[PDB]
Amino acid sequence: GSSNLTEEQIAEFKEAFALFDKDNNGSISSSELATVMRSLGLSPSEAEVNDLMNEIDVDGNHQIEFSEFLALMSRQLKSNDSEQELLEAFKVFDKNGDGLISAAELKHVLTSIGEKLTDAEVDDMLREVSDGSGEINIQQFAALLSKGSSTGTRRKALRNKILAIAKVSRMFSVLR
Ligand SMILES: [Ca+2]
Ligand SMILES: [Ca+2]
Ligand SMILES: [Ca+2]
C-alpha cells in the first residue's frame, strides 16, 4: 500500500494506535476515535467520525485496525507531510497561541491521550528541540517530528504519538 516501513516501524504506529484503542482489541470505534480528537479539544460529530474512520477502514467495520491505522500514517501525508502534521500538531498543541508550545501545551496534550509526563519530563522533553529554552515553535516543534537523533527506536514512538494526534486530527479536516 505504497508503504515503506520496517517491522520495527510497525511497532511505531502501535503507539499511535493506543491513542484511541483503549482495550486494544484491534478496532478503534467512532466512540473511541472521537474520544481522542475531542480529548485534544476537537468535537467531531459521530456522523463524520464515521465517514472518517470509514475512509481508512479496509473492511468498513466502522473501526480502525492496527493495520489500517498504520497504513493511514503512510497513506495520509504526501509531500510536505511533516510540515502538514506540523502546523496541525502545532496549532493543536498551542492552546494559548504564542507560536511556542510550552510545557503544559505539551504535557497537557500528552495527558490528553494518556501520557502523563512530569513538569520535569516535559520541561526536559522540550530541551530536545527547545535548546533548553522552554517552548517549541513551528520550527523547534518540527525539529521533534524530524528528530530521529537521540531516539534509538524509542523517541521515534514518543513523537509518533503526536504524528497521529496531528494526522488523525487532520483527517477530520480532510474527511470533509
Ligand atoms: Ca478499541
Ligand atoms: Ca478494521
Ligand atoms: Ca503558547
From Swiss-Prot:
Ca(2+) 1 binds at D21, D23, N25, S27, E32. Signal peptide: none annotated. Changing E105V: Highly reduced affinity for Ca(2+). One of its GO terms (cellular component) is cellular bud. The modification Phosphoserine is found at S82, S102. Keywords: Calcium, Cytoplasm, Cytoskeleton, Metal-binding, Phosphoprotein, Repeat. Belongs to the calmodulin family. It comes from the Eukaryota. One of its GO terms (biological process) is positive regulation of Arp2/3 complex-mediated actin nucleation. The gene is CMD1. This is Calmodulin.
